[PDB]
């Protein structure tokens, strides 16, 4: 069991689509890495200057859209690649 | 044609009836053996001389004159040393720390044969040498390319050590005393390094010379055959050099040609009869 | 005995595995330096603007996943290499 | 005597060891500057936004491990080289 620190979130990157808006199979650099994933673990919460900590908005089980960058890190847990990043990288939650 | 008298007669006849040339060639053949190599080069005096070297010797001297412990002869001599065979370039001392500490505990000299050693490592080694922590000498590995690797493996089989290479799957920092070769004496000077009575099982040496013989049987050019024969002689036989003596240069060239003819004729007579 | 100041943590990074997901020996640059270590010493805690100090969330004993960077420093204590870095470089705690 | 301002600390860099884990003498670039020093003088303390000042955690007399950088300055006092740097450059205190 892996749990993040403060306001970091662990997500599982979804498989990139092969057939796009029809039967056309996309092969090569065109298939951009999918920016949707399923959150697995959520940290305790970001810490304020005064001293109180507030819980994150994202709940375990939500599909999120995230901005890949230098702040997003890749880690291999349970022989499975997962993404560890700060909650500020989360842009929207699907449904 | 097996007896030495017949060989001397063949060499005498082939050298335009010169008894000294035939006698010298017979002596060289007797001393060096059957798997050895005899070469002829120019001398300096007026008389022919024969120099036969037994064991392993290559044309590499020490990488620093400060390694000398016997200034009387100007040479490095080590008694019962360790041999570190590295198929790599050594520049940072940090890779050398563990084995150096281990040999310091053991208390016997160490000879490092590497592709080349950088100035920082030379400075560290020369500092450590006379201060009494460890007795170290370093030389460059003979040959260039694949032949250098073959010579390193030959030295490893002779001394009973293992070559440290990246391509084989080992690193220098993980070396132990088992990986280091051993010998009885090592003599180093300006130009040549000589390993005397390296400890090794005859089975490995015989396997290596058999492998090189099978390599000889499948080579085309004469230069490669000569190099392989030199390697076989270094492993098992000996190496002889005949220095031709003459007053002038025309006489020198004439006598050198005659001695080479006698050498070729003796080889042919030994292999096929008379 | 080494004790860090404020919110710094001393860890001992784990040995890089040789056999990976089978018997295949991984030799060379493929074996990336392991980003898991066992914390040895934990600082008193980070200092807030008003002045009170809050304790760090990592306890001595657990395994952490950390992000190696310019902020992470290596030091030799007890003739053993250890890693000193700020607590903010800790991403997750295993188990 | 020399007294630092605010949260600056004056230390005396330890002599770089020659023999390493045995009798092997290291000469040249191998012997790096030791990151340990003896604290000589300690400033009054860092000043907070409100106006209160809190004294530094390092006391005069202990051995510290410091991160040499552009913030660390070298000064020749009493015909002796000393290092003046902010307290944030101190990583740990030995013993």
Swiss-Prot record, chains A, C, D:
Activity of the GroEL-GroES chaperonin complex requires Mg-ATP. Pfam families: Cpn10. GO terms for cellular component: cytosol; GroEL-GroES complex. The modification N6-succinyllysine is found at residue 33. Disulfide bonds: none annotated. Together with the chaperonin GroEL, plays an essential role in assisting protein folding. The GroEL-GroES system forms a nano-cage that allows encapsulation of the non-native substrate proteins and provides a physical environment optimized to promote and accelerate protein folding, probably by preventing aggregation and by entropically destabilizing folding intermediates. GroES binds to the apical surface of the GroEL ring, thereby capping the opening of the GroEL channel. Regulates the ATPase activity of GroEL. (Microbial infection) Essential for the assembly of several bacteriophages. Heptamer of 7 subunits arranged in a ring. Interacts with the chaperonin GroEL. Can form asymmetrical complexes, composed of one GroEL and one GroES, and symmetrical complexes, formed between one GroEL and two GroES oligomers. The asymmetrical complex is the functional unit. It was suggested that the symmetric heterooligomer may represent a transient intermediate in the chaperonin protein folding cycle. Another study shows that the symmetric heterooligomers are substantially populated only in the presence of proteins that cannot be folded by the chaperonin. This is Co-chaperonin GroES. It comes from Escherichia coli (strain K12). The lineage of its organism: Bacteria, Pseudomonadati, Pseudomonadota, Gammaproteobacteria, Enterobacterales.
Swiss-Prot record, chain B:
Phosphorylated reversibly during heat shock. Can be UMPylated on a tyrosine residue by SelO/YdiU, probably under stress conditions. GO terms for molecular function: ATP binding; ATP hydrolysis activity; ATP-dependent protein folding chaperone; identical protein binding; isomerase activity; magnesium ion binding; unfolded protein binding. Forms a cylinder of 14 subunits composed of two heptameric rings stacked back-to-back. Interacts with the co-chaperonin GroES. Can form asymmetrical complexes, composed of one GroEL and one GroES, and symmetrical complexes, formed between one GroEL and two GroES oligomers. The asymmetrical complex is the functional unit. It was suggested that the symmetric heterooligomer may represent a transient intermediate in the chaperonin protein folding cycle. Belongs to the chaperonin (HSP60) family. The modification N6-succinyllysine is found at residues 140, 184, 253. The chain holds residues 138 to 411 of 548 of the full protein. During the substrate-folding cycle, the two GroEL rings separate for effective substrate binding and chaperonin activity. Ring separation is triggered by ATP binding to the trans ring of the asymmetric GroEL:GroES complex and avoids formation of functionally impaired symmetric GroEL:GroES2 complexes. Activity of the GroEL-GroES chaperonin complex requires Mg-ATP. UMPylation of the chaperone by SelO/YdiU negatively regulates its activity, and may facilitate survival under stress conditions. It is an enzyme of class 5 (isomerase). Its main location: cytoplasm. It comes from the Bacteria. Each subunit is composed of an apical domain that binds non-folded proteins and GroES, an intermediate domain and an equatorial domain that binds ATP and is involved in inter-ring interactions. Forms a large central channel that appears to traverse the entire length of the cylinder with no obstruction. The central channel of GroEL functions as two cavities, one in each ring, that are separated from each other by the crystallographically disordered 23-amino-acid C-terminal segments of the seven subunits. The entry and exit of polypeptide seem to be restricted to the apical end of each ring. Modulating the volume of the GroEL central cavity affects folding speed in accordance with confinement theory. Small proteins fold more rapidly as the size of the cage is gradually reduced to a point where restriction in space slows folding dramatically. For larger proteins, either expanding or reducing cage volume decelerate folding. A stepwise reduction in cage size results in a gradual loss of cell viability. GO terms for cellular component: cytosol; GroEL-GroES complex; membrane. Keywords: Acetylation, ATP-binding, Chaperone, Cytoplasm, Isomerase, Nucleotide-binding. This is Chaperonin GroEL. It is found in: Cytoplasm.
